[PDB]
Amino acid sequence: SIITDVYAREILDSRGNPTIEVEVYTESGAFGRGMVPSGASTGEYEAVELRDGDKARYGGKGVTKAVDNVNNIIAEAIIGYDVRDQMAIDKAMIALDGTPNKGKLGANAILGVSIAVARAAADYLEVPLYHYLGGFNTKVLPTPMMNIINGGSHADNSIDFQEFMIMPVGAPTFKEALRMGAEVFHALAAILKSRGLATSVGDEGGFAPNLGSNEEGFEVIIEAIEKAGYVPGKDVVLAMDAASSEFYDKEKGVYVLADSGEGEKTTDEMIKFYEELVSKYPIISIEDGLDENDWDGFKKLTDVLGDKVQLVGDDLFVTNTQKLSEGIEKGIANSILIKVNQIGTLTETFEAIEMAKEAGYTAVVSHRSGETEDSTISDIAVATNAGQIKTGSLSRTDRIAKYNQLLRIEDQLGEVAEYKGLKSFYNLKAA
């Protein structure tokens, strides 16, 4: 059970950019492989990944530095430990780096080891990853937030919001929900190609048609739901990622809906906008509806909509338990988006999920634009009985691999598997 080898290597992510991969071997023969997704090389409160910056190689995006760190620094510091001591190992790697950003060794280097280790252990004990991470009572399959229509900067159309997602809350199981989202996804692709719109896909694997406004985004999605055979009421609901920081002007102090063409709006106006969109559409979740610094505005948004709408904070909290408690106290938002490579280790991730839960908040495990076949976040979702997950559209293996993995979990879980659907929003008092 004692780690006898920790070896990193450079590989590619779903976007053609190098990333790290770590393999841990125990003396018994147990193996574990951790693959890290594309994080950020810069952030004030965000853990930072380590890039080489060699303009001549991979456009400076190589991670030969992080690999070297793992193989020559982290490896010998970890070799000797018992693969099962997750907490102790992450604690060390964190102290070895010695910095909060994990800037010395690199968050990508630390995370790959953290994950490989955990997987190595699961393997050693011959148990599924989700049981090894969360215990015996790990059975609630996440209700997915599926990307379907893209806008803002992740598109070239008239839609200010970054992305529109569908949530199959009316399904009896994850498997059916998956089927539900897939049939809608296709019904829609049909509506677009027949409407003359582009059908190619982006990073999340969703559509980025050139719709005319924001309303034409939700509306077209409603069409697909109905064409697919499901009712927009109970079968499929709506979720969105506004990513308002994108169309927010620090200097002007207002939000500017360029793409939409609706001009500029005030935070009071934006909160009003969301109130209009929510009455006209079955929107259950709004992500980063106000700028990452509008701490005051989020509080108001939370007061008016928080009772019947999930307000998620992505750029707002940056998986930083620090900022999370700041929001919890002030009472801003009621759900946090968890990005593993953004925090750094598995134990820190779990700590965040627990702090969130204890606040009556929701923890939406998430993916990044540059993913890999690794589906560790799916086991995490089930190991913590999170209740939801946001891992992409129903295209591209970098996204499907996570859904296929949830199928297996639901499958090997048998008659004890659970799908809460709408009953997953324990954070929403009113319906």
Residue nearest to Mg ion (CB): 241
Q: Which is nearer to a second copy, 104 or 179 (CB)?
A: 179
- Choosing from 23, 204, 292, 371, which is the catalytic residue? 204
The item of Mg ion, a second copy, none sharing an interface with residue 241, based on CB under 5 to 8 Å by kind, is: Mg ion
Please, what is the minimum distance in Å from the beta carbon of residue 287 to Mg ion?
5
Is residue 336 close enough to count as binding Mg ion by CB under 5 A? no
Q: Which of 6, 110, 243, 290 binds Mg ion (CB under 5 A)?
A: 243
Is residue 241 close enough to count as binding Mg ion by CB under 5 A? yes
Q: Residues at the annotated binding site?
A: 162, 241, 287, 314, 339, 368-369, 390
Report whether 201 contacts 149 (CB < 8 A): no
Q: Which is nearer to Mg ion, 39 or 62 (CB)?
A: 39
Report whether 365 contacts 346 (CB < 8 A): no
CA distance 359 to 333: 11
H-state helical runs in 106-173? 107-125, 129-134
- Eight-state DSSP code of residue 188: H
Please, what is the minimum distance in Å from the beta carbon of residue 166 to a second copy?
13
Residue 329: burial class (beta carbons within 10 Å; 0-12, 13-18, 19+): exposed
The item of Mg ion, a second copy, none sharing an interface with residue 11, based on CB under 5 to 8 Å by kind, is: a second copy
**Strand arrangement, sheet containing 363-366:** 143-144, 388-390, 363-366, 336-338
Is residue 288 close enough to count as binding Mg ion by CB under 5 A? yes
**Token output for 419:** 């799908």
Q: Which is nearer to Mg ion, 164 or 403 (CB)?
A: 164
Q: Which is nearer to Mg ion, 129 or 364 (CB)?
A: 364
Residue 276 appears among annotated catalytic residues: no
Report whether 324 contacts 335 (CB < 8 A): no
Provide the CB-side half-sphere exposure for 237 (13 A, CA): 25
Q: Which amino acid is at 196?
A: G
Residue 204 appears among annotated catalytic residues: yes
Residue 414: burial class (beta carbons within 10 Å; 0-12, 13-18, 19+): exposed
CA distance 218 to 9: 43
Instruction: Return the closest-CA partner of residue 285 out of 391, 387, 165.
Output: 165
∠ CA 169-173-177, nearest 5°, is 50
Judged by CB under 5 A, the chain residues 73 through 132 that form the site for Mg ion are none
Please, what is the minimum distance in Å from the beta carbon of residue 404 to a second copy?
4
Please, what is the minimum distance in Å from the beta carbon of residue 364 to a second copy?
21
- Choosing from 61, 102, 323, 339, which is the catalytic residue? 339
Instruction: Return the closest-CA partner of residue 174 out of 420, 419, 422.
Output: 419
**Token output for 160:** 């200010």
Helices (H) and strands (E) in the chain, counts: 14, 16
The item of a second copy, Mg ion, none sharing an interface with residue 186, based on CB under 5 to 8 Å by kind, is: a second copy
The item of a second copy, Mg ion, none sharing an interface with residue 9, based on CB under 5 to 8 Å by kind, is: a second copy
The item of a second copy, Mg ion, none sharing an interface with residue 41, based on CB under 5 to 8 Å by kind, is: none
Using CB under 8 A, list all residues that contact a second copy.
9-17, 21, 56-59, 178-179, 182-183, 185-186, 198, 200-202, 208, 229, 371-373, 393-398, 400-401, 403-404, 407-408, 411
The item of Mg ion, a second copy, none sharing an interface with residue 56, based on CB under 5 to 8 Å by kind, is: a second copy
CA distance 107 to 292: 22
Any idea how long the chain is? 431
- From 166-174, 265-273, 288-296, 359-367, span contacting Mg ion (CB under 5 A): 288-296
Q: Which is nearer to Mg ion, 69 or 366 (CB)?
A: 366
Q: Which of 21, 314, 371, 410 binds Mg ion (CB under 5 A)?
A: 314
Residues near Mg ion (CB under 5 A) are 241, 243, 288, 314
Q: List the catalytic residues.
A: 204, 339
